[PDB]
Amino acid sequence: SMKLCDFEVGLDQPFFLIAGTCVVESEQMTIDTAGRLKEICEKLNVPFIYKSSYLGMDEGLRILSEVKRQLGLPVLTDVHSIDEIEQVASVVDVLQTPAFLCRQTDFIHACARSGKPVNIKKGQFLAPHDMKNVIDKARDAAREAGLSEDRFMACERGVSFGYNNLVSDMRSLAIMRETNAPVVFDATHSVQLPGGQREFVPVLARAAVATGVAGLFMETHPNPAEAKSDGPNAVPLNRMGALLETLVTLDQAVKRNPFLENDF
Amino acid sequence: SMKLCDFEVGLDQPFFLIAGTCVVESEQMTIDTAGRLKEICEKLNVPFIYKSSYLGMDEGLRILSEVKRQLGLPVLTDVHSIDEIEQVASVVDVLQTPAFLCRQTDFIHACARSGKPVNIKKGQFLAPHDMKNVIDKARDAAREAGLSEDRFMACERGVSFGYNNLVSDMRSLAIMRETNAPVVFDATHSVQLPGGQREFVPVLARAAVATGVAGLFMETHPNPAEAKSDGPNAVPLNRMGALLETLVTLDQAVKRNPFLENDF
Amino acid sequence: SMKLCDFEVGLDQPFFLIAGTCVVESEQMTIDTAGRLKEICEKLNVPFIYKSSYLGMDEGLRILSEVKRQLGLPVLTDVHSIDEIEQVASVVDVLQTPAFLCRQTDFIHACARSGKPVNIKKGQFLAPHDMKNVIDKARDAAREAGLSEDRFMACERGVSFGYNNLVSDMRSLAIMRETNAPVVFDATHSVQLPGGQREFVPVLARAAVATGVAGLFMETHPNPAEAKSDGPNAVPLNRMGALLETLVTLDQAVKRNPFLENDF
Amino acid sequence: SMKLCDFEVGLDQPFFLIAGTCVVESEQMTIDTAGRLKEICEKLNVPFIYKSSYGMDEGLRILSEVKRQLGLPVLTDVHSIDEIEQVASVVDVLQTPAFLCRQTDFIHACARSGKPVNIKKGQFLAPHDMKNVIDKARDAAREAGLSEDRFMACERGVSFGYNNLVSDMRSLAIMRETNAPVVFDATHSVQLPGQREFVPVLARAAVATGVAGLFMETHPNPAEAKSDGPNAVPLNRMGALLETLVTLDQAVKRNPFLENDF
Ligand SMILES: [Cl-]
Ligand SMILES: [Cl-]
Ligand SMILES: [Cl-]
Ligand SMILES: [Cl-]
C-alpha cells in the first residue's frame, strides 16, 4: 500500500474514488457536489478525493481551497505546464498530469519534484508496458530531489482504436502492476470518442474494479444536461450512490482472495 | 430468458459455463475432465455445457456422445463446414460457428436450420453493432424451417487490434444485448495473439462477468503443459473452482439490481 | 455436502429453499404458486423444492405429481403414519416427518427405509443435542436396508417456551451440526403461537441464515388473507423475492469464511 | 437516530460496538486492549465505546486514562444510587444491571445523571415491558431538565427453565417500540446462570435481526482473564468477527426491514 493523503491505497486495499464536476463551475456547485459526494462515500466507507479542473486558475484554485477547508476533503487537479506546478502544489493534495504530456520528461520531472503525489495519466499512444519507464523516470526525479518514490499512480484512460475511438484494454490494468504503483482507472475519459457515451461509464467501471484497481476516477454532475463542460459523459449525482455500492461489492469480491493471474 | 439444454439462460439468469479441453485428446482425458468440471459446477450451482473440438471427426463425436451418455452432460462443439452440420447436429446439443465464417450466410443459415441451438462467434473483423444483422439472418432461416427463433447466442471472442493482437472491448458485451440473444464471452480466445497469455484469462473473465453476460467459455486442462492444443492459454483444472467461485460472486453482484447503463 | 434432488446441500453450500402453500388448495393454486417460486429462485440461484401438505391424500398427491410433471420441480410432503409411506414415497422426492412424531422410532424408521430422503422435524419438546440420536437411529435403518446414510436433514421448528409460545434458540442451529446432517430452519412454524405472527418470519429467517444453515422452509401464498390454512403466518408471494434477496446476501457473508465458532 | 458520544446511533445507522475486558485488571491490560480495539474498529468504521467493570476509585481512574490517552468514550455499570454521581463524572455512558430494571428510584437516578444510560432488560421481563421502563426513565429525565433521547434498551437473555437463558430474536424487533436504540449483549446472553462458541453465533443472528449496537467482552488471552474468561472472545479474532458483522449489518439495513410491511 502507498500512503495517499490520510489513507492507504493499493491493489491490496479498498479502492478509492476521485470524483467531481468536470470544470469548476461556481462555488456553490463545487461545494454542494463535494459535500454530497462526501456523504455518499462516507456511508459506503469509500476513501474519496475531490477533483475539478480550473473562472480562471486563481479563482478555481481558491474554490478548491474551500472544498478542502470546509469539507476536510483532499483535492486533486490537473496541471498543464511547468510554470503552473508551484502554485497548484501549494493548494491541492494530488497533482494529475494530462495524458498527452506523459512523455514530456522535463514536465513529468517537475511534477515529480513538486513535493506532492502525482496521478500520471497514460497517453492514448502508449502501450501498458511503457508506463514502467514513465513511472521510473518520475521516481528518479523524486529521488534526486530527496523525496520518497512511493508517490505516483498510473492512470488508465483508454488507448487509440482506429480513428475517433478509444478502447479500454483490461489487460493494461494487470500489466501496469509491474510499475509497483497503484493503478487508477479513469472511467469517464475511457468512453470518450476523440476529435454522449454515458451508458458505457458504468460498464467500464464495473469491468475495471472487477479486474482489480487501486482507484477509480469518475466525473459527475447534479443535472448533466445543464453542465458547463463534458456533460454527456458525466454520471448523474443521484445515481453515484447505487453505482458505488455495486463497485464496492465487486472490489471486495476480487480482493478477498489473491488474484488468480498471480498464480500464473 | 432463453431455454438452453435443460436450463434458462440470459442476462437475468445466473451465468452458464461452456468449458473443456481444446480438442478431444482421448476418451479418458475427456470423460475425466468433463466429470471433474461437472462436480465443480454442481457444487457452485453453475449450469454447465462441455466443449471440445473434433483423432478425426467420427472419433471426436463418438467420444462427445460418451460424455453425454456416461455423465448426462450437454455438449457443444464447433462445426467447420456446411458438409459436417448434419452429422455434428445429430450428436451434440449446441453448435458453434467459427468466428471467420460469421458473414458466410449459407453456412450460418445451415447451422440455424440444423434443429439445434447455435453459439455464433463474432468475427474479429466485425463491429459489435454488426452482430444484430447476423442474428437476424440466423433467425430468418430458423423461422423458415418451423423452428423457434430464440435458439441463438452472440459470442464475443475479441476484435483485431493492430497486428498479432486482439482487444476485448467490454462495450461490445453491452452493445450486443441489442441482438435480444444471450451474450457469451469467450475468455480463452479473447487473449490469444493471432498468427502464453494464460495470465489474462482470469482478468478478462472477471471483467466480462462484471460487465454482465449470459455465459462464459473457457478452455481448461488437468496439466496444460502437456495439452495437445492451445495449452499455453488453458486454465488449469485445479484452479477452475477458485475462479468460478469468484465469478459467481461477481455475476450475482451485477445482476442483483438493474444494470445502471439501462437508465441511460 | 449431501446430494438432494438435483443439487448439493450442506452447511458449506448456498442455502436451499423448501416452500409452497401450507395445504394443497387446488391444482391451479399449487401449479401457479410453484411456477412463481420456480422463476424467483432460478433468478437468485437458490436451489428449490416445492412443498404442500395433503382435498384428501390421493388428490393431494395427484396434484403434487402434477407439479413434477408440469414444472419438473422436486416436491416434498409430510407423511403422518407408517401405512401412508409407501404411497407418498412413490410420488414425492423428499419425505418430511411431523415434529410430534420425532421420537416414534417405528415411524421414523419406516420413513428412513422408504428409499427417499427425509427432512426430520425436531419436536418442540426436544433439546438440540437430542436430534443426534434421532438421526443416528434413522441412519441405522437406512444402512440395514442397504441405503446411503447421508439422506437426512435435521429441521428446527421452535422449542416450547412457557404456554402458547415457541422460541427459536439460534444455538440449536449450531449444536445440530453435530448430527453431521444438513440443518434446515422452519421460519414459518417457529413464529407460531401454539393452541398473525407474520412480522417475525423475516426476523427469524434473517437470524437463522446469518447463524448458518443448509436450508430454509417457508410457507407462502398469493394472498394469505384468503389462505385455506395458516394464512396469518404465510409470507406473501410478492414479497418472497425481496426476502430471498436479503437472505442470499446474508448466506454468502457468513459462508465466505469459516464460522468463528469452529475455532471454539 | 440518537446522539451518543461523538456519533449517531440507531436502527437506521451503522451498528456500534461496546467492548472491553470483563473487569479492570490493570492499567496496562486496559490501555493495551482498548488501543487494539480502537485500531480494529477504526479500520472497519465501527463506532466504538470501551467498557470495563470496577476497586471503584482505581477502576474509574484507569477508565479516565483510556479517555485521556486514546480519546475513546467509556461505559461502565453502576450498582447503587450512591455510586451514580462519581461514575457519571468520569464515564460517557452509564449501564444498569439487569436485575435492577424495575428498581425505579435507581433507574430515575441514572436518568437524572446527565449521561446517557444503556438499560439492561431483566431476565424476568417480557420484551414489551421495556417500553414502560424507558418511558419512566424519560419522565425522570424531562422532570429534571434533560433531553429524553438518551436511553438504550439492552437485550441480555431471558430465563429458559433453570440455569439457562435463551436469546429471543423477536425481542430485538419488539423493543423498537421503545423508540430507543436496541443493544444486544452477546456475551451475557450465552451465560448459564464455557459457552464462548455461541457468542459469534448469537452476534451474527442479532446483527442480521437488526440492532443499533452490540456488546461483546474480549481478552488478549481469555484463559488468563480475571473474570468470565470462558465467555470472552479472544482479541485476535475480533477483527474477523467484526468484519463479518459489518457485512451483515450493511446487508440488512441497505433496504427497509421486511417486517415493517407486516
Ligand atoms: Cl464504439
Ligand atoms: Cl499485449
Ligand atoms: Cl411473544
Ligand atoms: Cl443449552
Author numbering:
A (entry chain B), B (entry chain D), C (entry chain C): 0 to 53, 67 to 207, 215 to 283
D (entry chain A): 0 to 53, 68 to 206, 215 to 283
Sentences copied from the publication:
Here we report a functional and structural genomics effort that applied saturation-level transposon mutagenesis and next generation sequencing (Tn-seq) to identify essential genes in B. thailandensis, followed by high-throughput structure determination. We used an “ortholog rescue” approach to maximize structural coverage of these gene families, which are likely to be essential not only in B. thailandensis, but also in related, but more virulent, Burkholderia species, such as B. pseudomallei.
By using an ortholog rescue strategy for insoluble or difficult to crystallize targets, we increased our structural coverage of B. thailandensis essential genes from 31/406 (7.6%) to 49/406 (12.1%). This structural similarity suggests that the ortholog approach is an efficient method to obtain useable structures from otherwise intractable targets, thereby lowering the barrier to structure-based drug design targeting infectious organisms.
